[PDB]
Amino acid sequence: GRDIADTTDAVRDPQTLEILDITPCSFGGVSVITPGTNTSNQVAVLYQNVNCTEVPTGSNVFQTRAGCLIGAEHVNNSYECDIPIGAGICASYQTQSIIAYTMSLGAENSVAYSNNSIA
Amino acid sequence: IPTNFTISVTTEILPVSMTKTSVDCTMYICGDSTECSNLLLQYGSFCTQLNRALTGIAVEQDKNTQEVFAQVKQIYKTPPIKDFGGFNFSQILPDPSKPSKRSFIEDLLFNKVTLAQKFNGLNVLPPLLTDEMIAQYTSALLAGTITSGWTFGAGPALQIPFAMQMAYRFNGIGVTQNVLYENQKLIANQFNSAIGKIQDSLSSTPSALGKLQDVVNQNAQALNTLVKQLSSNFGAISSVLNDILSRLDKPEAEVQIDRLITGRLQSLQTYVTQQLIRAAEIRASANLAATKMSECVLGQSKRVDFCGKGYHLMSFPQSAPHGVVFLHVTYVPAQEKNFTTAPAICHDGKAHFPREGVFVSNGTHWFVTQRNFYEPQIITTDNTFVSGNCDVVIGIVNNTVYDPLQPEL
Amino acid sequence: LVKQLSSNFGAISSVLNDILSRLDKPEAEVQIDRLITGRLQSLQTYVTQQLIRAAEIRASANLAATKMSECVLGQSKRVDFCGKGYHLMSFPQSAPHGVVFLHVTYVPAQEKNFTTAPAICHDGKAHFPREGVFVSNGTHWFVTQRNFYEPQIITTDNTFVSGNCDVVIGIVNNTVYDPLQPELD
Amino acid sequence: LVKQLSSNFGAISSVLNDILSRLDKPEAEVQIDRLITGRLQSLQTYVTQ
Ligand SMILES: *[C@@H]1O[C@H](CO)[C@@H](O)[C@H](O)[C@H]1NC(C)=O
Ligand SMILES: *[C@@H]1O[C@H](CO)[C@@H](O)[C@H](O)[C@H]1NC(C)=O
Ligand SMILES: *[C@@H]1O[C@H](CO)[C@@H](O)[C@H](O)[C@H]1NC(C)=O
Ligand SMILES: *[C@@H]1O[C@H](CO)[C@@H](O)[C@H](O)[C@H]1NC(C)=O
Ligand SMILES: *[C@@H]1O[C@H](CO)[C@@H](O)[C@H](O)[C@H]1NC(C)=O
Ligand SMILES: *[C@@H]1O[C@H](CO)[C@@H](O)[C@H](O)[C@H]1NC(C)=O
Ligand SMILES: *[C@@H]1O[C@H](CO)[C@@H](O)[C@H](O)[C@H]1NC(C)=O
Ligand SMILES: *[C@@H]1O[C@H](CO)[C@@H](O)[C@H](O)[C@H]1NC(C)=O
Ligand SMILES: *[C@@H]1O[C@H](CO)[C@@H](O)[C@H](O)[C@H]1NC(C)=O
Ligand SMILES: *[C@@H]1O[C@H](CO)[C@@H](O)[C@H](O)[C@H]1NC(C)=O
Ligand SMILES: *[C@@H]1O[C@H](CO)[C@@H](O)[C@H](O)[C@H]1NC(C)=O
Ligand SMILES: *[C@@H]1O[C@H](CO)[C@@H](O)[C@H](O)[C@H]1NC(C)=O
Ligand SMILES: *[C@@H]1O[C@H](CO)[C@@H](O)[C@H](O)[C@H]1NC(C)=O
Ligand SMILES: *[C@@H]1O[C@H](CO)[C@@H](O)[C@H](O)[C@H]1NC(C)=O
């Protein structure tokens, strides 16, 4: 066979004459999420664009849109972006570990709008 | 001098960001071939140079988005009672019934722009801010400008009635407050219609968002081109690295592999070089968009044709896939009338000049008018001033200046 | 750029003197050509990057020059062009490879809510404020400037009249104190 | 860009016809490929600038 560009993507077996599809093994970029080494030696590792079922720990494992994040503790809180990860997710170091969270866009406010009032 | 006016809304489209691509240089060139990888190392840090160049711009793409948006320290909400003096913003305000919390118009923008995925060492990184987050910033800016005018762009957000806010914006273009208040229904109606017309403009005028679609198309073409180059076979016996390795001996393969490496190095270097140049173009666009955000959303600019054609009153931002859309609200004068004029009037031997206005003639009588709207008034000492005699002004005409106080004696 | 000199671009060694010392003409020529191609490409890459980076700096310099002209040599009305707040002035300071601007801006504080209206009705006429806004502290109406509360008495010298009061949405009844009355009496 | 054409980028001659005339097929191919690389480099340089 052949893909839109190149590579067979499929072959016919010479003895059974069956067709097998060939999918390249999973891969992706690996990045280290760290505070300064003059602050802490604990880091978290992100495997980019992979599933949580891949990369042969538990508890400190969170799946995000950007890939599989291992070593950071996910919380339901929000803060200013510190170490940006992607898709609204970022991490920060607090004291005694690395925390993963959805970033805040700022404090909320509501203007006391009225047809007859000004400030 | 115009006796009427039209409030119109124009749409401006500006790109803000690119696709945050990344490349595994070794995987692109060598893949899983150990022999090819060892040869690649002979080219030094080339592989790292490309990684850093692409990373640089990948980061820049979030910087660009953050500069255009995130111009607010607080996220402002829209009041539960939308009494804005008759001005209907329902098409630009977020629609709560949808999970994306987008405005009606924003959905049109996202639906019109169109965004095989084989991984050969090439990949794509997500934006730091999500579409929902951008919508929240857009909504904050919009809620702010509707309820607090430009005050939120300076310090604290200070509440003001929308009708009075417009009065300031009209005054800001040289048109007195009388014009708004006495025509508020007309103005609100023209505005509401002008906004509704946006839907037709975006629905038709096919595609419309050419600028944003072109950015997407260019990035997609660049990646597709880069992939296709793998098949070129740059002087080597075979485009397939495994085919060379399985057919030739070691030193025999090395001389063929070097050719594939050389060509692939050129292909990657070319791709990155172009991305750096395109990134600069987008950065400039983002800087312009950010400039406009600050000058046309957080205030009213006096820069001609910088914020739509006509006299600028206000604008509203809307999000878009890889950019920002500005809706510019401008004042354009209409229904011109021919009047006879003069630079000054000769009274009791003294030359009278108009104060914040111009002298016009009805044919039999002279009046003071404002510019950009006729609204005439009788000539008195309150709307004129005196400087010297009447023998120095060229084109000066005769007339009486009336009742400073004489009726009250 | 320097580290790339040590790279052996398909040659037997990355040291030119070594190639020249150990090989004769017909063999050295080949090894040398390999290093030339590699080094030339590395240098071309360097220059290309410098040109692109230079463009970024040029744009920054153009912005800096623009800002100095508009922020230091005058007062700008461009929002957030001179930092947050209303621009008063800017003081430049030198720096190693750039310029630093200290932007002085006016930022309003400690706001209070007042009752307002677009106009006042007096003797059937619609009175509009001149260079100010009508406010009320709950019992009395005043006219003040927009950017700093200063409640002045509403008089004929602070207002102007258009037409009647049947066309204004939020007009309120009040008295405009014509300053001539006490001068006439 | 034009002057770059009159250059032997490690080649025996800047002229393709001379290469084809003087060398046989398997030898000319190498010299031609060499000029192609050099001349493409010149076009890439021109366009980049
Ligand atoms: C090989 O030939 C045998 C018959 O001798 C047949 O049954 C079998 O399916 C063929 N293919 C394979 C994979 O054995
Ligand atoms: C490391 O952190 C300490 C905190 O007290 C600080 O004094 C020191 O200068 C820092 N060193 C470096 C290299 O940052
Ligand atoms: C991971 O694999 C499981 C298989 O059941 C699938 O349901 C899940 O959606 C996958 N997650 C991602 C991020 O691909
Ligand atoms: C905190 O996040 C976890 C994620 O699994 C969730 O199960 C839990 O309910 C959240 N707690 C609160 C208070 O939202
Ligand atoms: C003034 O605004 C504050 C903040 O919204 C509000 O709490 C207060 O009740 C308002 N006072 C009046 C008189 O509107
Ligand atoms: C201005 O034009 C509109 C139609 O566009 C009309 O309805 C309105 O009455 C006109 N106003 C004046 C003062 O003529
Ligand atoms: C705004 O326009 C929409 C159009 O569908 C209409 O349904 C809505 O009632 C209008 N709102 C106001 C306040 O006029
Ligand atoms: C003003 O005079 C010019 C003379 O050419 C004429 O064309 C124009 O229509 C007139 N405009 C009005 C409003 O009468
Ligand atoms: C304005 O012009 C008309 C003729 O077009 C004239 O009848 C009228 O009296 C003039 N206005 C005044 C105040 O005289
Ligand atoms: C305008 O031009 C005409 C040309 O004949 C001249 O007679 C008239 O005096 C001029 N008026 C003014 C104010 O210059
Ligand atoms: C204007 O008034 C003066 C008063 O002395 C008179 O002499 C002059 O002729 C008048 N001009 C015209 C055009 O009537
Ligand atoms: C403010 O309100 C008080 C009554 O609470 C009133 O007597 C006073 O005149 C008003 N205006 C000023 C400037 O105090
Ligand atoms: C303000 O809104 C109320 C209803 O909430 C309405 O009765 C009142 O007339 C409005 N006043 C003005 C000036 O719009
Ligand atoms: C007071 O204001 C109301 C507003 O509806 C108006 O109807 C009424 O005539 C005004 N009172 C006087 C004496 O004008």
Residue numbers in the entry:
A (entry chain A): 546 to 601, 618 to 656, 670 to 693
B (entry chain B): 694 to 808, 832 to 1125
C (entry chain A): 942 to 1126
D (entry chain C): 942 to 990
Paper excerpt:
S is a large, trimeric glycoprotein that mediates both binding to host cell receptors and fusion of the viral and host cell membranes through its S1 and S2 subunits respectively. The S1 subunit comprises two distinct domains, an N-terminal domain (NTD) and a host cell receptor-binding domain (RBD), that are both targets of neutralizing antibodies with high neutralizing and protective potential. NTD contains a non-glycosylated immunogenic supersite centered around N1, N3, and N5 loops that is a hotspot for spike mutations, including deletions.
Multiple study participants from Peru and one from Argentina infected with the C.37, lambda variant, showed common mutations in the NTD and the RBD and a unique large deletion of residues 63–75 in the N2 loop of the spike. Since the spike contains deletions in the N5 loop common for C.37 and N2, the spike has been named ΔN25. The ΔN25 variant derived from the C.37 lineage with a large 7-residue deletion in the N5 loop acquired an additional 13-residue deletion in the N2 loop. The quaternary structure of the ΔN25 spike was less stable and showed a higher fraction of monomeric S compared to the ΔN135 and Wuhan variants. The Tm50 of the ΔN25 spike was 2.5°C higher, and that of the ΔN135 spike was 2.5°C lower, as compared to the Wuhan spike. From the ΔN25 spike dataset, one stable class with one RBD-up was able to be refined into high resolution. The ΔN25 spike has a 7-residue deletion in the N5 loop typical for the C.37 lineage. As a result of the deletions and N-loop shifts, the 3-strand β-sheet formed by N3 hairpin and N5 (βN3N5) on top of the galectin-fold is lost and as a result, the N4-loop is shifted away from the other loops.
